[PDB]
Amino acid sequence: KVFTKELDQWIEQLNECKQLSESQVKSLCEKAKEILTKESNVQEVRCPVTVCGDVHGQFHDLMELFRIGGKSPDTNYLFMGDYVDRGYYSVETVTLLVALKVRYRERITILRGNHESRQITQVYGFYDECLRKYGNANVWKYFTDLFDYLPLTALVDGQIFCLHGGLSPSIDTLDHIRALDRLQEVPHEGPMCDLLWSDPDDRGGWGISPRGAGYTFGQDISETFNHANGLTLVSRAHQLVMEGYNWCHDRNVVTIFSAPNYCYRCGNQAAIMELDDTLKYSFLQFDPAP
Amino acid sequence: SMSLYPIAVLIDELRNEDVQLRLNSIKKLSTIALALGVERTRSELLPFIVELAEDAKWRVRLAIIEYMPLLAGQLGVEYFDEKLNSLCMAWLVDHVYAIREAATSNLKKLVEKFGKEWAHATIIPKVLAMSGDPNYLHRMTTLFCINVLSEVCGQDITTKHMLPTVLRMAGDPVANVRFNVAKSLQKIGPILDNSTLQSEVKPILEKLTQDQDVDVKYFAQEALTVLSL
Amino acid sequence: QNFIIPKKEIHTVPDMGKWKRSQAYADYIGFILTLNEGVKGKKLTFEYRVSEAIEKLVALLNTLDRWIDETPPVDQPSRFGNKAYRTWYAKLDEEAENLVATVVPTHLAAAVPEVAVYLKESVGNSTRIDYGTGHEAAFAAFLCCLCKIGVLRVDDQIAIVFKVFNRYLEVMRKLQKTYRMEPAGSQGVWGLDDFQFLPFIWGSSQLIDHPYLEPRHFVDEKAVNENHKDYMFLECILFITEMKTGPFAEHSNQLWNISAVPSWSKVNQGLIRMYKAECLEKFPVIQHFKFGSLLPIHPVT
Ligand SMILES: Nc1ncnc2c1ncn2[C@@H]1O[C@H](COP(=O)(O)OP(=O)(O)OP(O)(O)=S)[C@@H](O)[C@H]1O
Ligand SMILES: [Mn+2]
Ligand SMILES: [Mn+2]
Q: Suppose B13 and one of A68, A97, B25, C264 were both cysteines; which one would form an S-S bond, judging by CB atoms 3.0 to 4.6 Å apart?
C-alpha cells in the first residue's frame, strides 16, 4: 500500500523522537477513528500480551520499555491509558502509540485514561505542549477528538480485566459496560467516570473518592466483581507505585505504573506485566533511560 | 610486561556496588586482557567476568555480551566450548529483550571468528532447542537467530539444519511467530537454491497468505513478491 | 461573631465562575498581594516585630514537628507513601481545635471550629498521602482567617511570611521527605514546582530591585548556597537541587525559563498572573476549597 510506506516511515521517524507534521497528525487521527469505532467498550484481547500502565509523556522511558519487553509488532502490547500530560514528550509518545495502532491494530490495544480528555489535558500540560510544538490548537483538537473513541476497558482471554481506574457501584457486570456510550468527553460523574477514576483501598465496601471523582473500593467488592464476571484478575493503573507494580485485595487486583522516577523526584521503578501463551503473569521492573 | 599491574584495584572496580565503575572497568578489559595474556586472564579475571554475565543491571550484562567476541578471540575456540558456550546461550533466554537481541548479534560475530563448521557443531542445535519453548517471546528468538545466522552459515547448513525449523513454525498457534516465519523466509530465501525455493518455500508462503491474521497475510504476501515467486 | 464549619461549594466545572466572582476569592488574592507588598526588598534576617500570637503559631508548628519525631516511618510494604503519615494526620485531626485555641483568645473562642478546618486541610491528603499547592493555599487561607478575626494585625504582616509561613515550609519539607509523600496535582515540566507555589511569589518580592542578584543567579549553585539564609526563593531552589535528579534545565523546566527573565520585578509580576492562571483557576485544585463565614462563596460585597 502507498499508505503503509507512509506509516512505516512515520513510525521510524517517531522512534527517533521527531514529531509528525500537523497535516500528517490529522490523517493519522482520521484513520485511527475508523479503526477504534469498530472496537467494543470491553475490547477483546488475546494472550500472549504485555500490559503497561502510565507513561505521562516520558518518551525515552517508553523506548526503554520496548528495550525491556520487545518492539512492536513482534511483542503484543496493551496500554491502560494516561499517555499524555506532565512529561516533555506527550506529543511524540501519543503519536507513536496511535501510529502503531493504525499500522498493527491486532498487535496493540490502547485504552482511555482520565488524562485522555479535553478537561484534564488543559490542566496538566498536553494543551501547552501542542501549542508550543505546532503553533496552534489544531493538533490538540485532532487528539482530544480521537480520545473519545478509545475503548474504556479490555478483556484478555475472557479472564483478566484491564482498565485505567477501577470499579463502579453502578456497574455489576461487563454487559453494563458494553451498553455505555463512550463516544463523549469523560463525564464528571457516573459509570464511565468511575471506570477511569476509581481506586482500590484498604477499607471494606464502597467509598466516595478523595480525588473528587470516582469511588474507592475494598477487597470484598473486588472479590464479588471477579467471581460474578468469571475474572481471575483486575489489571489497572492510575496510581504511582514505588516498586513499579503493586498487588492488593488478596491478588484480585494489580496496579501497574510505567513512568520510572516520576517527576524526576520519586525514584520509583516502572513495571510491565507479561502474559504467557497460557495466561500466566510475570513482571519486569525497570529504571529510566541513562 | 604486566607482572606489576595493580590487578587488585581492577577487581575491586569490577565487583563495585556502584554501577558506573562496573561499566567503566569492563571498557578496560579489551585492552587489559590482551596485555595480561591468556593464562592470567583465565585464572585471575574470568571468574569476575562470569559473575557480571548475570549482573542484576541489564546494561552491565550488555557490555559483557559486547566484550564476548574479543574474549573468545583471545582465549581460542577449544576453551570457549568448555566454559563459555553456556553463558552465551543463557543470554538468549534472558527476560530483557535488549539482552536477547544482543546475544543474537553475538552469535553472528562468534561464527565469523570460529567459522561455519563450528557453528553447526556447537550453536545451531541450542538455537533450534528454543523453537519448542512455551513462551512466544523465546520461540521468536529462534527465528531472529536464524535470520542473522543464515548469512554466515552458507547455503548448505541453512538448507539442512535451519530451514526445516522455520517451515515447521509456520504452523504455530501464535500469529507473531507465524508472521516472523514469513519475515525469516524473505531474509534467508536468496541463500537457498531455486529448486528448494519453488518446492518447499513457495507452498508455505501461499498457505500463509490464507491465514486468519492480517499481519501474517501481509508479510507472507510481501515475501512472495520480494523473492519473485 | 457568627461562625460556621467551612464546606465545599465548587462541585462542577460550571461552578468555577461562582468561585471567580466570590468574596472568598477577592479576599484571598487581596491577602496574598498584601503580604507580597510588605516583604518587598527585605531579607529574612530583617529586624521586625514579633507578637505573642506569632510566637504561639510557631509553637503550634513545632508541636506538629514534634509529632513527626514521635511518629517515625513504619517498615511495612506500601504503594508509595509511608502509612505512618496517616497516624500522624489522625493526631492533627483530634488535636487541631486545641492547638488553635492556644493561638486564639478566649473571647473569640467561637471562631476556633471554623478556623481549625483550614489548618486540617493544609498538610496533605491522609488517604492519598499527598501534598499539593491546594494544601499550601489552605494554610494561607488559615492565616487569612486569623487576620479577619483580628488575632493577627497589620504589624504582623512581615512576621507572618518570614517567621510563620517560613517555619511552615520546613515542616512540610520534613513531611514530604520523612513519609515519602507524592505530589498532588503536579503539572510536571509545565508547572513551577511539584509541591509549592506561594514561597516563589513572596520570595521573588524580596529580591525586587536587588543590587546584584538577578533571576539568572538562582541557577548558580554558589549564589544559592551563599544567600539562601536570606531569601525564601533560593531556599526553594536548594530543596529542588537536593531532591531532584539530573541537570536543572531538565527537572525544573519552568524555573529554568524564569532564570532568563531580566528582573525579579517581572518574575513577581508574572508569578502572580501564573498563580491565578494555574492554581486559582484550575478546577481539580479549587474543588477542594472550603467556604464558611470568613471566606464565603457569596458574591463579593
Ligand atoms: N494543586 C493541587 N493541590 C492539592 N490537590 C490537588 C491539586 N491538584 C489536584 N489535586 C487533587 O489531588 C488528587 C491527586 O492528584 P494527582 O494524582 O497528581 O492527579 P490525578 O489526575 O488525580 O491522577 P492521575 O495523574 O490521573 S494517575 C486529584 O485527584 C485532585 O483531586
Ligand atoms: Mn496517571
Ligand atoms: Mn490516571
A: B25
What are phi and psi for residue C130, nearest 5 degrees? -120, 160
Q: What residue ranges define each of the domains in chain A, with the CATH number in brackets?
A: 1-290 (3.60.21.10)
- Helices in chain B by DSSP H: which ranges? 7-14, 19-44, 46-53, 58-75, 77-83, 85-90, 97-114, 116-122, 124-129, 136-157, 163-168, 175-188, 194-196, 202-208, 214-226
Taking alpha carbons only, the member of A243, A137, A153 closest to residue A194 is: A153
| Contact present, C12 and C124 (Cβ < 8 Å) | no
Indicate the Cα dihedral angle C25, C30, C31, C36, nearest 10°: 130
Interface C:B, ≥3 CB–CB pairs < 8 Å = no
Cα gap B17→A149, rounded to integer Å: 48
Give dist(CA A79, CA A57) in Å, integer. 13
CA C185 to ligand 1 center in whole angstroms: 4
- Report the alpha-carbon angle A263-A51-A212, nearest 5: 55
Q: Give me the residue label for grid cell 490464507.
A: B210
Domain C192-301, CATH 1.10.10.10 — does that match? Answer: no
Domain B1-229 indexed as CATH 3.20.20.140: no
Place of cell 521527531: A18
Tally Cβ neighbours within 10 Å of residue C187. Answer: 22
Tell me if residue C21 falls in helix, strand or coil. coil
The H or E element containing residue C58 is helix C52-69
Report CA(A114)–ligand 2 centroid distance (Å): 8
C154 closest CA partner among C289, C54, C247, C251: C54
Question: Domain extents for chain C?
Answer: 1-191, 192-301
Count how many Cα atoms sit within 13 Å of the Cα of residue A133 in the half-sphere of its side chain: 20
Contact A56 C188 (CB under 8 A): yes
C-alpha distances out from residue B124 to B89, B106, B146, B189, C17, Å: 11, 14, 9, 18, 72
Min Cα–Cα distance to chain B from A255, Å = 21
How far apart (Å, rounded) are the C-alpha atoms in residues B2 and A289?
A: 38
- Chain centroid to CA C129: 17
Length of chain A: 290
Q: How far is CA B202 from CA A286, B143, B199, C225, in A?
A: 43, 18, 6, 73
Type of residue at A267: G
B48-to-A147, B14, B110 alpha-carbon distances in Å: 52, 7, 21
Chain A residues touching residue B97 (CB < 8 angstroms): 66-71, 75
